[PDB]
Amino acid sequence: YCRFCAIGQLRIDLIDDLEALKRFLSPYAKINPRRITGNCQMHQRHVAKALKRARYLALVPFVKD
Amino acid sequence: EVKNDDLELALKKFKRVSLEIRRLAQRHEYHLRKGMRLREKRKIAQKKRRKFR
Amino acid sequence: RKNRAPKRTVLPDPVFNNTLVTRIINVIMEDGKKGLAQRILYGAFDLIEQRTKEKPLTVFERAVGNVMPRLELRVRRIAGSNYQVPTEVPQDRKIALALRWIAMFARKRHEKTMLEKIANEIIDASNNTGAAIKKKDDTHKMAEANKAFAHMRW
Amino acid sequence: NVSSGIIHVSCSPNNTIVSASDPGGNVLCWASSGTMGFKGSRKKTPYSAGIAADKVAKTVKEMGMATVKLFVKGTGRGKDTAIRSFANAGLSITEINEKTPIPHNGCKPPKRPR
RNA sequence: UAUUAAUCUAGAGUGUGGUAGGGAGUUUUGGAAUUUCAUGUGGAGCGGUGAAAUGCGUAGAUAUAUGAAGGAACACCAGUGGCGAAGGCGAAAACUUAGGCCAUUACUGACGCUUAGGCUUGAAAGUGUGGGGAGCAAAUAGGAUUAGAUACCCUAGUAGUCCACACCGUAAACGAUAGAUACUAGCUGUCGGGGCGAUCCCCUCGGUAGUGAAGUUAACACAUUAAGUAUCUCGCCUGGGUAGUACAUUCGCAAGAAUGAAACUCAAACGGAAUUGACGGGGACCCGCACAAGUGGUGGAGCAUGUUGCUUAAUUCGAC
Numbered sequence: 001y002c003r004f005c006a007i008g009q010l011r012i013d014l015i016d017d018l019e020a021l022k023r024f025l026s027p028y029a030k031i032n033p034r035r036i037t038g039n040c041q042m043h044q045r046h047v048a049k050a051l052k053r054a055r056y057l058a059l060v061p062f063v064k065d
Numbered sequence: 066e067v068k069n070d071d072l073e074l075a076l077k078k079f080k081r082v083s084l085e086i087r088r089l090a091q092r093h094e095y096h097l098r099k100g101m102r103l104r105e106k107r108k109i110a111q112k113k114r115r116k117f118r
Numbered sequence: 119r120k121n122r123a124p125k126r127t128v129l130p131d132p133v134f135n136n137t138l139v140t141r142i143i144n145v146i147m148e149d150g151k152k153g154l155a156q157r158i159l160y161g162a163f164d165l166i167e168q169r170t171k172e173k174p175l176t177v178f179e180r181a182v183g184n185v186m187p188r189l190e191l192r193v194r195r196i197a198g199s200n201y202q203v204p205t206e207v208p209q210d211r212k213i214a215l216a217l218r219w220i221a222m223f224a225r226k227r228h229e230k231t232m233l234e235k236i237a238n239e240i241i242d243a244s245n246n247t248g249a250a251i252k253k254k255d256d257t258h259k260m261a262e263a264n265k266a267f268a269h270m271r272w
Numbered sequence: 273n274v275s276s277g278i279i280h281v282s283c284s285p286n287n288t289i290v291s292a293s294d295p296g297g298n299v300l301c302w303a304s305s306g307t308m309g310f311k312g313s314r315k316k317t318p319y320s321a322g323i324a325a326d327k328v329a330k331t332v333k334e335m336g337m338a339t340v341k342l343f344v345k346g347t348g349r350g351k352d353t354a355i356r357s358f359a360n361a362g363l364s365i366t367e368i369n370e371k372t373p374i375p376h377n378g379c380k381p382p383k384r385p386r
Numbered sequence: 387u388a389u390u391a392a393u394c395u396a397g398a399g400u401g402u403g404g405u406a407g408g409g410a411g412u413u414u415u416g417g418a419a420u421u422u423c424a425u426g427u428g429g430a431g432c433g434g435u436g437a438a439a440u441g442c443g444u445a446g447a448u449a450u451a452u453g454a455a456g457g458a459a460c461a462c463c464a465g466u467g468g469c470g471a472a473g474g475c476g477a478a479a480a481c482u483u484a485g486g487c488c489a490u491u492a493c494u495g496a497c498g499c500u501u502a503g504g505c506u507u508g509a510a511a512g513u514g515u516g517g518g519g520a521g522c523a524a525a526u527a528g529g530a531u532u533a534g535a536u537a538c539c540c541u542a543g544u545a546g547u548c549c550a551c552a553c554c555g556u557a558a559a560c561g562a563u564a565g566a567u568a569c570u571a572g573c574u575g576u577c578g579g580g581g582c583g584a585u586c587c588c589c590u591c592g593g594u595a596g597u598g599a600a601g602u603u604a605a606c607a608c609a610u611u612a613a614g615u616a617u618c619u620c621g622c623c624u625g626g627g628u629a630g631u632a633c634a635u636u637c638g639c640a641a642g643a644a645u646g647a648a649a650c651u652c653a654a655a656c657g658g659a660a661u662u663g664a665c666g667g668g669g670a671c672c673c674g675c676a677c678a679a680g681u682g683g684u685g686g687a688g689c690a691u692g693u694u695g696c697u698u699a700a701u702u703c704g705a706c
Contacts, residue, residue, distance in 0.1 A: 002586095030086075030461075040578090044463060044467080045407095048478095049463085052462085055417080056478035058417090062417045062477075063373075065086055065374070067368065067370070068368055071365075079368050088347070089461060090418085096380045111466080118575080119673055195436095208679095211680085214679095262319065263319065270349065272436095286435080289432075289449070290448095294451090297426070297450050298450075299450050302428060302430090302431090306433090312438060313438095373419055373461095374418050374419085375460090375461085378460085379419095383523070385539075
């Protein structure tokens, strides 16, 4: 199931769109795979890099469970 | 993992992600080469994909 | 790969009108013939009732109900050690084990005619004097020790 | 001693250790599956872990912990029997915490069991 | 055609515009925490396996939480994903920039193509050079066990795994399928790009995949990304065991790399794959005192037979 480029902006930073990123997120340091949200390569890049970036800036649990 | 305020229900929904994260950490608690790790991981991934497709 | 096969028994005995007395006669049956065993058990019940002054049938059934077993084992090894899977055993084998234990512990005395000692052992098993009640108690206790080995599948 | 302390349960490939602490990093009592003397395959059984955790659960129930913080750690046959042992001993499960670390090969663990 | 005298683009490509890859490197941190130290409490265990033990604990543990330090590597995202020349690329963040995908009568007008020689790079061990070394394992060493463990078990554990430099430059770098080039039923998927439009559906082209036609490997199978079709160039190839031996020559003090006969000797290869089976010490279906669940004896006593054996003049001989 494609998620980005339909609810996203094709330009994903942390601010202004963090909720679409957190939709593949939990306070548990995990990202929903393609089996639940089958987003394409660029959308997977978006969610991966941006979510681990929010983890990197101390916005959401980096590894914390 | 943290599921609060329930003794059994939230604990039941807990145990799934709890064991998932526990196994995710467990397969990182022993030294191994990238070969077997990736081969088995992608074999399981393709098994799940073929079961899904 | 034998499937389930039903168990068989015989008709009751008029001394008690129960199958347990006849099955005890079958088990204690020497000379392969049941007349001697029937006489032995009749005298046993007479000596049961004349000792402690209590009715033989309720004594005998209490004995077979407190010797009552509740388990059978399926052995399996992991690599060099063998443990047990507790399995539900049919009630036929349960009553069979109870009666066989009664019969075997009835004749383990060498002092007089077998009549008095079989009566005394039936009384003891009814009054929970340890000859086979301890086996039931140990099975119940080890039912909290072998289920651990039953849980994991090696 | 605190109203809601912790009882940390570790499940090593042989044994189940239960250690009861205050949140201020002070363990006030302890137990283990080696305390009652079982060794090897027997102390890995769920019964051994349950009996080991029931001791600390009860003693923290009297000594001041009405409830406890339920920290689960590790995976095994005694990872969750400790939780129910705490629960039945008066330590109602306020919350559960699976704070198991997820390392990234920060070490090189020794030869792997076979 | 090798050559010459010109041109035209369409091969090399280049231009424009749209244009993406965990591409590489550079520069940063952040954490799961690993280990250690102090704060402490705890009051006899921790630990490891198939089994224990070795080992660790009473200068206060098991364990726990804070604070501080040093090293290592980054949970998920991770793709019938893309890119990078292979080597490879995944905690994130930035920069330089190779290169890419889409369509261009657009421009030189063949500028082309590869490649022996030649240029560069090249997992990695392991070498020394300076740090810390968090952790562990080659080697080594104890307890097991064994017919024996420096094999499978663990504890102690160095080189090393970490980084800076060279060298090692080999790999299952093998798709055991060369590079450039153009073409071959489809079908079902994905990613990227171009157009379009709630999304989308859709079309275009590639990339990334497959069943399978045709075609092609004995066969196994590949099959629009061929092992199909064909051109230029190069490398590898004729029996086994000897044998990559032996030599010569070299790159690096250091670990390694190319290297190449032959004596002797045997008809193939611990050969390949369509075919059948038992085994599994990988597994799978179905019957069976085969087991268990048991019931009774025997091996333990005596007894008769039958046998092994010894023996003489036979202890007849076949059966084991």
